Design an enzyme around this catalytic site. Structure first.
Site, PDB file in Angstrom:
ATOM      1  N   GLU A  80      21.650  37.376  47.707  1.00 43.21           N
ATOM      2  CA  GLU A  80      21.224  36.483  46.756  1.00 43.21           C
ATOM      3  C   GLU A  80      19.935  37.057  46.071  1.00 43.21           C
ATOM      4  OE1 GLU A  80      22.597  33.617  46.395  1.00 43.21           O
ATOM      5  OE2 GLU A  80      24.119  33.963  48.045  1.00 43.21           O
ATOM      6  N   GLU A 134      27.856  35.274  41.452  1.00 48.81           N
ATOM      7  CA  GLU A 134      28.822  35.407  42.705  1.00 48.81           C
ATOM      8  C   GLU A 134      29.646  36.843  42.233  1.00 48.81           C
ATOM      9  OE1 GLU A 134      29.468  34.013  45.409  1.00 48.81           O
ATOM     10  OE2 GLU A 134      28.429  32.227  45.170  1.00 48.81           O
TER      11      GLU A 134
HETATM   12 ZN   LIG Z   1      24.291  33.607  45.903  1.00 51.18          ZN
END
Ligand SMILES: [Zn+2]
Length: 195
Positions: free
Chosen positions: A160, A118
């Protein structure tokens, strides 16, 4: 080596980090901030320049006033378990908010360390001005974007793939060697951003 870079970087993180009001694990909170100090001062200074804060939590997400509307909203894959953002392991956007002990692998997410992952969603979309949109990266993302698994997460947003590969590039040497072997062009992309 030594701890000099880490000592400077943990002192730069002091300037943008926010802790809970009480009742939290201070060793694991300070170890999260140390694991993030181990990354790079150039990106840490750039988030400090952008006033982007690190919110460490040990309670409800809805107890922060900037998430007061976030009570009954259901995130992808949590409809089947009846869960909401109020109990999330951590998130990113205009600020990164991170839940002590829940950002650990397998606590309702499949990421290898959600703290660093994150945080890398913030480095990407603040400091690199969302480099994950760029066609030269995109050729490699279409080639190597899932060779480290987590596919129902790495297949949803391009940050991601970047942040999981970046976490494999920072967290430990077994994950460095696995990423080098699985996504070789991606390690050669990441070294050229990092230098
Ligand atoms: Zn993520």
């Amino acid at each position: 080596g030594d701890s000099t870079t880490i000592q400077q970087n943990k002192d730069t993180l002091s300037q943008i980090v926010v802790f809970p009001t009480g009742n939290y694990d201070k060793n694991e909170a300070n170890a999260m901030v140390n694991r993030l100090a181990n990354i790079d001062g150039k990106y840490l200074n750039a988030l400090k320049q952008n006033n982007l804060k690190i919110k460490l939590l040990s309670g409800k997400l809805t107890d922060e006033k900037e998430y007061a509307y976030l009570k009954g909203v259901v995130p992808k894959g949590w409809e089947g378990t009846g869960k909401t953002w109020d109990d999330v392991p951590g998130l990113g956007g205009s600020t990164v908010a991170l839940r002590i002990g829940f950002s650990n692998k397998g606590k309702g997410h499949d990421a290898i360390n959600l703290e660093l992952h994150e945080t890398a969603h913030a480095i990407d979309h603040i400091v690199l001005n969302d480099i994950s949109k760029s066609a030269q990266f995109k050729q490699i993302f279409a080639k190597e974007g899932r060779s480290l698994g987590n596919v129902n997460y790495l297949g949803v947003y391009p940050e991601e793939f970047f942040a999981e590969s970046f976490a494999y590039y920072y967290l430990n040497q077994d994950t460095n060697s696995k990423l080098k072997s699985a996504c070789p062009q991606t390690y050669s992309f990441l070294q050229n951003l990092a230098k």
